[PDB]
Amino acid sequence: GSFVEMVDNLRGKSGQGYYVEMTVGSPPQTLNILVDTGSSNFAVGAAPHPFLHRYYQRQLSSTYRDLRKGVYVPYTQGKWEGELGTDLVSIPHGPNVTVRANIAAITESDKFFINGSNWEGILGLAYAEIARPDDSLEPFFDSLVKQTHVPNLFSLQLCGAGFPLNQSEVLASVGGSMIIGGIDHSLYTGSLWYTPIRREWYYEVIIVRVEINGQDLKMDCKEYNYDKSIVDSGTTNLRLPKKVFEAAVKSIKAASSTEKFPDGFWLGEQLVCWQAGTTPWNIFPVISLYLMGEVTNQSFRITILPQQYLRPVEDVATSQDDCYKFAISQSSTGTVMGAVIMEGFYVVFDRARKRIGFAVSACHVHDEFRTAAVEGPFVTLDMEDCGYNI
Ligand SMILES: COC[C@H]1CCCN1C(=O)c1cc(C)cc(C(=O)N[C@@H](Cc2cc(F)cc(F)c2)[C@H](O)[C@H]2C[C@@H](Oc3ccccc3)CN2)c1
């Protein structure tokens, strides 16, 4: 590990998001910020809200600059409205630099802030193409790279605990690492495999094959990327296009048929519980997603375990049972490789070389019999045809 200052700088969990501490303004105002590779706006609460115990106070920053323009961002789930401006921003446990970046001061919001999440803003790390109001509003990472010598790359190690974390614990626990400008070798085991960033807007990739316990889902690969597939730390679940979800659930149910679960479980709505320590991990299948490789007709695969797609939750009766919710759900906007997927790997967002790397995470949850994996190469033909075009 060559970036000790940034290792273990994240906190949080799937379900509420992973966040990093940042400062805005002069003198610096400390705020916890959700790391979101699924959007491109840097926005922070800038007015009182029931779920915030602190917020950005522009009138107290001598370096605040008003851009005199409104901004509105309606995410798939959640939305906010605010006022644009710029100010000096730093990341205490990050590169030792300070940059002037665009900041959306949130004045109104609906289902955006989460009670007890401990974060007060969001850091959209994707590209300008999807920034609101439009691509003229330079994203934070673009500003960072343009104003400093920080390499154009960042990597994320999101660490799920494998069990529920109460309010006290989640605040004291290390949730992972965001290495700005590099790759820390202590955060992963094995080799890093890279898939091309198809287009620079979201971090879009192309899935070329899907397996459930080695069994080919057998769908036209175009379906897997309809209408796109993205790597998104801002979304908890692995979300799959309607038809893929239906096929995947049917196959996962078949593989785990020795136990019957209620429909509410498969809809990702209700939890299932087992006596402490008896979760039957072995009856659930591993899921492999093959991604386009960097070499022609070559692919590699990432394999996750039920320890990744079954999200630990506290029992309603706060009993001693180990409970979980199915963290795979339906999408109408393409595949979303969310947090529960990212928790199994160290993910390298290599913007400079337009590629995303994957390696087995040093902090992924597993058992004595199976582990997550990143393997390759595999001969795969006509992978370009797996990509969707409107
Ligand atoms: C971590 O999970 C935390 C849990 C708690 C509540 C949110 N959440 C989810 O798992 C979840 C579920 C869905 C079906 C959508 C989004 C969603 O829209 N996420 C966005 C970020 C976000 C928004 C919030 F209001 C609250 C958050 F905690 C996180 C991404 O940018 C998504 C949205 C889309 O990209 C867009 C869409 C519109 C504009 C710009 C980008 C693809 N990336 C997030």
Swiss-Prot record:
It is found in: Cell membrane; Golgi apparatus, trans-Golgi network; Endoplasmic reticulum; Endosome. Induction: Up-regulated by the Ca(2+)-regulated transcription factor NFATC4. It comes from the Eukaryota. GO terms for cellular component: axon; cell surface; dendrite; early endosome; endoplasmic reticulum lumen; endosome; endosome membrane; Golgi apparatus. GO terms for biological process: amyloid fibril formation; amyloid precursor protein catabolic process; amyloid-beta formation; amyloid-beta metabolic process; cellular response to amyloid-beta; cellular response to copper ion; cellular response to manganese ion; detection of mechanical stimulus involved in sensory perception of pain. Keywords: Acetylation, Aspartyl protease, Cell membrane, Cell projection, Cytoplasmic vesicle, Disulfide bond, Endoplasmic reticulum, Endosome, Glycoprotein, Golgi apparatus, Hydrolase, Isopeptide bond, Lipoprotein, Lysosome, Membrane, Palmitate, Phosphoprotein, Protease, Signal, Transmembrane, Transmembrane helix, Ubl conjugation, Zymogen. It is a single-pass type I membrane protein. Glycans are attached at residues 96, 115, 166, 297. Residues 1-390 are extracellular. Changing residue 36 to N: Decreases beta-cleaved soluble APP production. The modification N6-acetyllysine is found at residues 69, 218, 222, 228, 242-243, 250. It catalyses: Broad endopeptidase specificity. Cleaves Glu-Val-Asn-Leu-|-Asp-Ala-Glu-Phe in the Swedish variant of Alzheimer's amyloid precursor protein. Inhibited by RTN3 and RTN4. The keyword Signal applies. Its EC number is 3.4.23.46. Expressed at high levels in the brain and pancreas. In the brain, expression is highest in the substantia nigra, locus coruleus and medulla oblongata. N-Glycosylated. Addition of a bisecting N-acetylglucosamine by MGAT3 blocks lysosomal targeting, further degradation and is required for maintaining stability under stress conditions. The active site is at residues 36, 232. One of its GO terms (molecular function) is amyloid-beta binding. Belongs to the peptidase A1 family. Monomer. Interacts with RTN1; RTN2; RTN3 and RTN4; the interaction leads to inhibition of amyloid precursor protein processing. Interacts with SNX6. Interacts with PCSK9. Interacts with NAT8 and NAT8B. Interacts with BIN1. Interacts (via extracellular domain) with ADAM10 (via extracellular domain). Interacts with SORL1; this interaction may affect binding with APP and hence reduce APP cleavage. Interacts with NRDC AND NRG1. DXXLL motif is required for a proper endocytosis and retrograde transport to the trans-Golgi network, as well as for regulation of lysosomal degradation. Responsible for the proteolytic processing of the amyloid precursor protein (APP). Cleaves at the N-terminus of the A-beta peptide sequence, between residues 671 and 672 of APP, leads to the generation and extracellular release of beta-cleaved soluble APP, and a corresponding cell-associated C-terminal fragment which is later released by gamma-secretase. Cleaves CHL1. This is Beta-secretase 1. It comes from Homo sapiens.
